[PDB]
Symmetry: C3
């Protein structure tokens, strides 16, 4: 199922290019590209990606920012596109395909705070998402979250599935072969990883005893819902889709639809390693367990 | 799997009969009947229906109305029944079977506002729902919704699945063959369609640039949950199950359980065509994409 | 898939041992043990259990209680452990394995009110949960629920799945063979049952006409989400995860993630039998229907 023009193609990852161009305007450039990713040990997936990552690179903007987004398509044969769930846009004008070896620029506002999925909008969308063209954009609320002052440390986690390679029958009728977490960096020194079964087990996220941790999370699917849970704690506060108004307290587990996001906050009271799972345990067994290592210093 | 007495049977659809009989009392009559529906192009399903539609015809009542419901059973051999999720009733007295060629009348109050599933209660209920005996009843809140004055246009959407014809093994162990949206008319001129893979793509719902749209939605299943999302917008306000108290804001995607409902509202800011999906993309690929065409005038 | 050391093993159920040892401290002792349970008529599952029940015995504590938990492992060969979702603990110190024929004691606080899953934490956790090592701990809120004074009668229900016996491939890739409810006693005279397809149909929970019923519910999975619904009523009030702050009203159906809990309350207005389902009807057909028998006296 590897089309002829993708055989042997492995386009090196490139950094996200993003810069502020006004008090409420930002530029973002990504590149659709075909990149080999090791999704499980010994298992390479020649992913359809933004910038050579799957999920793609994290985007963070402020509520009220207009995004002037450029997609460069490095794929030699397949068109690609971008749909940000954060934005108000005309899908048939603003989320349209960019042909191989071309670029397109689209402009649209991010009016709403939260933790939004982004993904390719090219038909069949299932094929583009399943092959790796998904990611998260965070829109920071102008008025913050009411618990901001309580948070000591924060990370981003994303859940996705992987199927048999570029197999539309499997994508629409089969169980996922792997379900995985990745983490995308918010600040210098944070890990930045791809959706695989092992990295966040072997290189756990780090925290310090007694801290309140915030996670910005999204389940990008393509197909499954997520029962998000941190072992050994309870979520003090949850904001559904990251909108400050959608405020729950004391949740053991947060139900995320496909493309669903949340801001979750919890306290780690003792040193140790804390697993992070989807509690749909078939998916956890197939890769969807990350680890948080809590030490007396917060360093390894 | 087409029982002998249903071979060749295709009972013409009939309109819903409903009339108000007091300030807080309504009469409703439906007919259980066997009707061929084209669920995908070239694919006829000899559905078990209310009134020859699947999902069945929309019912709208006011909070506090008592419903005097009559079911006429036109099926030559299978008993059928009605369960409205809106009502407080004794299931073993009020949701009981009506035999072939008979009628039954049942009375019960709709005390609670919202967007409720209805379906046959005859065992096996899975068989009756999967074969098409599902629908929505809307109960309008006595005090409205706090965002009523902001809404410019409204429609009803229903999600359902279709399986291999009358195949209980597939119904309980197989993936859906199709997942579909339909729209049921609230006002004269609104579309009224059945659950199929194509009608709401080829004949999109219509709206005008700048409008706030309300959708009354329910995922009737039988089996799947729904990750309901409108491309190119964000839900300004969501009322879970259509109860005004269950008020979320700024949701990208609304998680609906099987039988779950919602009132969702969103703004369309630019001309274009806006897909409406379940973001469980295996289901979207198998039919569950509707379209909203937004024009400068709101007409086609 | 019955390991040699479990052949012929059927360890008799034993009562939960629990006692208060201070105003905010309790002792609890359980025993990991291998016990034959009839999950469907004629179908024995040699379950991995706490105390010979699956789901395990109900635990009820007060918000702010510290639990001094002892696990005795009667399994001749497999290690087992305990993870309470109620507690703040170090998973790698406090949820660790107890070897065959050994005991371990762990201490941790239940700081948060609600209806929490508990289960074994031994890897693979999917295997331990699927084989029966799941249950519920209720933590009573110090300030109650705002609707406490309206409730006439209460019960606990738990949803779980059963798969092919000890079959890891089926656990992670197959549909459940059975999906079931059980009820765990809160007060003397309440039923106390295991997850099976039939007991709560043949011996329904009892209530009286006009009562407001509270159910403490949790869907322990391992793998499925639940669309929890009581036929013939609407939930007056719902508290997600049993936290009083997470308060919804007038819900027809409550979406529970895997491990998700709730307190749900509803009124039964007429005599009759009221089914209780997950509205994912493939699961209901495979066992997940319980009954509530409502009589003029509340007795049978
Ligand atoms: O609570 N994680 O199994
Ligand atoms: O956001 N619809 O893929
Ligand atoms: O509403 N139970 O089918
Ligand atoms: Cu610009
Ligand atoms: Cu793509
Ligand atoms: Cu999307
Ligand atoms: Cu009448
Ligand atoms: Cu029927
Ligand atoms: Cu129902
Ligand atoms: Cu002690
Ligand atoms: Cu165990
Ligand atoms: Cu758990």
């Amino acid at each position: 199922n590897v089309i002829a023009a993708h055989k042997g193609v492995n386009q090196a990852p490139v950094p996200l290019k993003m810069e502020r161009v006004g008090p409420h305007d930002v530029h973002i450039e990504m590149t659709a590209q075909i990149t080999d990713i090791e999704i499980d040990k010994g298992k390479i997936y020649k992913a359809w990606t933004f910038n050579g990552q799957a999920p793609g690179p994290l985007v963070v903007v402020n509520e009220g920012d207009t995004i002037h987004f450029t997609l460069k398509n490095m794929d030699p044969v397949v068109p690609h596109s971008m749909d940000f769930h954060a934005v108000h846009a005309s899908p048939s004008k603003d989320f349209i395909d960019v042909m191989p070896n071309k670029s397109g620029t689209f402009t649209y506002p991010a009016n709403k705070p939260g933790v939004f999925m982004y993904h390719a909008g090219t038909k069949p969308v299932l094929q583009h998402i399943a092959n790796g063209m998904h990611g998260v954009i965070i829109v920071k609320p102008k008025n913050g979250y009411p618990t901001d002052k309580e948070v000591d440390r924060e990370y981003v986690l994303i859940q996705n599935e992987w199927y048999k390679y570029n197999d539309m029958n499997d994508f629409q009728n089969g169980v996922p072969s792997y379900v995985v977490f990745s983490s995308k960096a918010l600040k210098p020194g944070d890990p930045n990883t791809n959706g695989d079964t092992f990295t966040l087990k072997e290189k756990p996220l780090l925290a310090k005893v007694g801290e309140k941790i915030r996670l910005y999370i999204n389940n990008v699917g393509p197909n499954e819902v997520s029962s998000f849970h941190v072992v050994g704690t309870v979520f003090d506060d949850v904001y559904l889709d990251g909108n400050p108004n959608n405020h729950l307290q004391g949740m053991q587990t947060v139900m995320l639809p496909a493309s669903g996001g949340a801001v979750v906050e919890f306290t780690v009271t003792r040193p140790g390693t804390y697993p992070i799972v989807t509690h749909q345990f078939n998916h956890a067994q197939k890769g969807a367990v990350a680890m948080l290592k809590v030490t007396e210093t917060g360093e390894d």
